[PDB]
């Protein structure tokens, strides 16, 4: 009965039928995106209305449509024809992944380039890469993918070990035309294989690892009701799934004695982008938005017990809509479990003689997605003490190139002749805050050093300052690790027992933001990535930091356009947008398959409770 329940197969089937009856789902149509809409502010009417948003592609060249449907009432609410030269192209379709390779296989310029390199076309894989917006006037309003080539020596070979450098092609996937084939020169195709399951490369497997057994003999401490509502150690929330964003957390709240206290209304990773820093024309256009362009949720893995998730695991299997409106289940796509997390609090007192130890634990909600060469794990953690944490785990295979003779300032060498271009992985967390309710504000907190002198005669004093962000135009902030900068989200109308406003503090990792030149195409299209923190006033239609249609959008959509409204955010319904990322100079140890590296952020209570919230944890 909950409005935040996962989409069911039956709901997806009704959308397909509603679209079909209305004449919007003909044979030349493809669903590029389908997702359930959140209830609007003021859901306290109990009037259930489940609405779905649909992006409909047309493979015959007609204009795509954005459609909103009520599955409860069986009606089309709105249907808009899109001018893609204006507002952007629709997300990449999984069925287009193979079309780039197949179109190039019959193009005379592509075949001439492969023949010069003595490459058999049947062995050449072509990655289907998003195009961006650059200098090619003929691409405006056309659906373009770019292709880079890799050789598979045999069907189980890792093609990433064998990039074909000096060659790139552009393809119009609707008209099935190869618009350009650029060949800048012959590079040797690196010869060593990268087959990390080949015993020749792994050597004899270790026999030294003994098993670690994690069991819960009485079952887990959390309960799941209504398919996706979790209660665990005073926490309460709903676990959503969206084909674009992946796992979304709703209605994060904490039961403080008698009262259920809201903390976060909606938490998601609303965009992620991988910009490449190699100035070669073969790759200098390369920036892929795995969320906005490819939709990370549709490529979620089925997670296997004992391997991907270890312990007493509860699974969710979300349902999404294929290019034709049929439901399919991502079996075991979300893992949920609790984990021991070491010591929570400990003290042995010299005067009372009391010895006290308590253990911590965390609730884990996670999924793993695979987009081409890269694989990412998304992890949300809830801790006993009120801390909320997000962690992204990056693994997979690094994107490769040739390593030029005489070296490179923008590419690392991984193996003889094999390079890996420098790049970043930058995420945007969208946190629709609800600290004790919707009247919230953000303060920026800096450490303050003090000069030795009157009132500070020994030169030991230091302090802090807090600056309230009152309008959107002043809420675009940068990190400052040297001054210990954090941001506090507080509720000025809800005080703790010391008559201080309740709050939560956001702790960033203070990694570098977008490194590209501010005048570049990617700085315009990924403007969110140039600053660490943005605060906007809540609005139903301000969902993504990059706008609704990221693919081949010319720039400036999303956050720079939102904040130009300069709305009041001092004690209002607000959304915090946090940029965080990894800057990756690949190392030899990243090849041929990369050990996990991590990045994330956390929020800790800051006077939210009237004392430690874990005094009632028992002694194990």
**CB of residue 92 vs ligand HY1: minimum separation in angstroms?**
8
Binding-site member from 21, 78, 175, 357 for a copy of itself (CB under 8 A): 357
**H-helix or E-strand spanning residue 565:** none
**Residue 290 is assigned to a ligand binding site:** yes
Contact 274, 304 (CB under 8 A): no
Report the C-alpha dihedral over residues 433, 538, 544, 364, rounded to 10 degrees.
Answer: 20
- Of residues 584-613, which lie at the interface with Cu ion (CB under 5 A)? 584
Q: Pick the closer one to ligand HY1 by CB: 125 or 441.
A: 125
CA distance 380 to 392: 9
Q: For residue 446, what are the β-bridge partners?
A: 465
**Residue 371 is assigned to a ligand binding site:** yes
Residue 584 binding: pick among Cu ion, ligand HY1, a copy of itself, none (C-beta 5-8 Å cut-off by kind): Cu ion
**CB of residue 280 vs a copy of itself: minimum separation in angstroms?**
9
- Of residues 546-565, which lie at the interface with Na ion (CB under 5 A)? 554
CA angle 385, 376, 599 (to 5 degrees): 45
Backbone conformation region of residue 555, classed left if phi is above 0, alpha if psi is from -120 to 50, else beta: left
Backbone angles phi, psi at 502, to 5 degrees: -70, 150
Residue 47 binding: pick among Cu ion, a copy of itself, ligand HY1, none (C-beta 5-8 Å cut-off by kind): none
**Residue 299 is assigned to a ligand binding site:** yes
Three-state secondary structure of 286-315: CEECHHHHHCHHHHECCCCECCCECCCCEE
Q: Pick the closer one to ligand HY1 by CB: 372 or 560.
A: 372
Q: Which stretch binds ligand HY1 (CB under 6 A): 56-64, 122-130, 150-158, 493-501?
A: 122-130
Residue 306 binding: pick among a copy of itself, Cu ion, Na ion, none (C-beta 5-8 Å cut-off by kind): a copy of itself
**Residue 289 is assigned to a ligand binding site:** yes
CA distance 482 to 504: 21
- Of residues 314-373, which lie at the interface with ligand HY1 (CB under 6 A)? 371-373
- 553 is a site residue for Cu ion (CB under 5 A): no
Positions annotated as catalytic residues are 290, 374
Residue 294 binding: pick among a copy of itself, ligand HY1, Cu ion, none (C-beta 5-8 Å cut-off by kind): ligand HY1
**Residue 372 is assigned to a ligand binding site:** yes
Binding-site member from 213, 258, 406, 540 for a copy of itself (CB under 8 A): 213
Residue 554 binding: pick among Na ion, a copy of itself, Cu ion, none (C-beta 5-8 Å cut-off by kind): Na ion
Site string for Na ion, 411-450 (x = CB under 5 A): ---------------------xx-----------------
CA angle 212, 218, 220 (to 5 degrees): 75
Site string for a copy of itself, 138-157 (x = CB under 8 A): --------------x--xxx
Site string for ligand HY1, 171-190 (x = CB under 6 A): --------------------
Q: How many other C-beta atoms can be found within 10 angstroms of the C-beta atom of residue 278? A: 20
- Of residues 506-525, which lie at the interface with a copy of itself (CB under 8 A)? 510-512, 515-523
Alpha carbon distance, N-terminus to C-terminus of the chain: 37
Binding-site member from 42, 343, 406, 540 for a copy of itself (CB under 8 A): 343
Can you say how many angstroms the Cα of residue 496 is from the centroid of all Cα atoms in its chain? 34
Q: Which residues of 191-227 are buried (b: 16+ CB within 10 A; e: fewer)?
A: eebbbeeeeeeeeeeeeeeeeeeeeeeeebebeeeee
Asked if the peptide bond before residue 94 counts as cis, ω within 30 degrees of 0, the response is no
Contact 19, 69 (CB under 8 A): yes
Residue 288 binding: pick among ligand HY1, Na ion, a copy of itself, none (C-beta 5-8 Å cut-off by kind): ligand HY1
Nearest to 489 by CA among 391, 602, 388, 576: 576
Which tokens in the block code for residue 357?
């130890």
**Residue 423 is assigned to a ligand binding site:** yes
Q: Pick the closer one to a copy of itself by CB: 21 or 463.
A: 463
- Of residues 126-145, which lie at the interface with ligand HY1 (CB under 6 A)? 127-129
CA 425 to each of CA 183, 274, 357, 451, 584: distance values in angstroms, whole numbers, following the listed order: 28, 5, 39, 40, 8
**Residue 584 is assigned to a ligand binding site:** yes
Residue nearest to Cu ion (CB): 584
Residues in the site for Na ion, rule: CB under 5 A?
432-433, 538, 554, 573-574
Q: Which residues bind Cu ion (CB under 5 A)?
A: 584
Q: Which residues sit at the interface with ligand HY1, rule CB under 6 A?
A: 127-129, 288, 290, 294, 371-374
């Amino acid at each position: 009965a909950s409005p935040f329940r996962l989409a069911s197969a039956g709901e997806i089937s009704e959308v397909q039928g509603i679209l079909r009856t209305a004449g919007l789902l003909g044979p030349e149509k493809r669903i590029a995106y389908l997702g359930v809409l959140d209830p609007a502010r003021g859901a306290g009417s109990e009037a259930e209305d489940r609405r779905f948003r649909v992006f409909i592609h047309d493979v015959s060249g007609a204009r795509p449509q954005e459609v909103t449907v009520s599955v409860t009432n069986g009606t089309v609410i709105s249907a808009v024809e899109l001018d893609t030269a204006a507002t952007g192209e629709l997300p990449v379709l999984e069925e287009e992944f193979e079309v780039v390779e197949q179109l190039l296989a019959t193009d005379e310029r592509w075949l001439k380039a492969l023949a010069a390199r003595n490459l058999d076309v049947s062995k050449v894989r072509v990655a289907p890469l998003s195009a961006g917006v650059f200098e090619y006037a003929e691409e405006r309003g056309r659906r373009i993918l770019r292709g880079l080539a890799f050789v598979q020596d045999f069907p189980e070979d890792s093609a990433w070990a064998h990039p074909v450098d000096g060659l790139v092609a552009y393809v119009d996937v609707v008209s099935k035309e190869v618009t350009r084939v650029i060949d800048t020169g012959v590079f040797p195709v690196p010869a060593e294989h990268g087959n990390y399951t080949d015993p020749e490369l792994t050597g004899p497997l270790r026999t030294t690892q003994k098993p670690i057994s994690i069991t819960q003999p009485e079952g887990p401490s959390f309960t799941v009701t209504g398919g996706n509502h979790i209660e665990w150690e005073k926490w309460s929330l709903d676990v959503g799934f969206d084909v674009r964003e992946g796992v979304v957390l709703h209605n994060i709240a904490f039961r403080d004695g008698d009262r259920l206290r809201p903390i976060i209304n909606r938490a998601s990773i609303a965009e992620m982008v991988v910009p490449y820093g190699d100035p070669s024309p073969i790759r200098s256009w390369q920036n892929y938005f795995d969320t906005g362009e490819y939709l990370v949720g549709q490529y979620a893995n089925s997670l296997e017990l004992g391997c991907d998730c270890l312990g007493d695991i509860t699974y969710l299997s979300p349902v999404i809509s294929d290019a034709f409106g049929n439901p399919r289940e991502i079996r075991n796509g979300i893992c949920m479990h609790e984990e021991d997390w070491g010591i929570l609090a400990k003290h042995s007192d010299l005067w009372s003689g009391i010895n006290y130890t308590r253990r911590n634990r965390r609730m884990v909600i996670s999924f793993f997605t695979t987009i081409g060469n890269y694989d990412y794990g998304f992890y949300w953690y809830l801790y006993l003490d009120g801390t909320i944490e997000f962690e992204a785990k990056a693994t997979g295979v690094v994107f490769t190139s040739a390593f030029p003779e005489g070296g490179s300032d923008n590419i690392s060498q991984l193996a003889p002749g094999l390079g890996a271009p420098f790049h970043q992985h930058i995420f945007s967390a969208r946190l629709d805050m609800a600290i004790d309710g919707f009247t919230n504000r953000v303060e920026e907190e800096d450490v303050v050093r003090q000069t030795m002198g009157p009132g500070n005669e020994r030169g030991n004093a230091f302090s802090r300052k807090r600056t309230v962000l009152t309008r959107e135009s002043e809420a675009v902030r940068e990190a400052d690790a040297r001054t210990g900068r954090t941001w506090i989200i507080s509720n000025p109308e809800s005080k703790n027992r010391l008559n201080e406003p309740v709050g939560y503090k956001l702790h960033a990792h203070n990694q570098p933001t977008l490194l590209a030149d501010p005048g570049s195409s990617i700085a315009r299209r990924a403007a969110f990535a140039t600053k660490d923190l943005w605060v906007t006033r809540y609005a139903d239609d301000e969902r993504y930091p990059t706008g609704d249609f990221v693919n081949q959008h010319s720039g400036g959509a999303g956050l720079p356009s939102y904040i130009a409204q300069d709305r009041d955010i001092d004690g209002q319904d607000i959304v915090v947008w946090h940029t965080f990322g990894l800057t990756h100079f690949p190392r030899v140890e990243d090849w041929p398959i990369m050990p996990v590296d991590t990045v994330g952020f956390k929020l800790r209570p800051e006077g939210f409770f009237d004392r430690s919230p874990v005094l009632d944890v028992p002694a194990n």
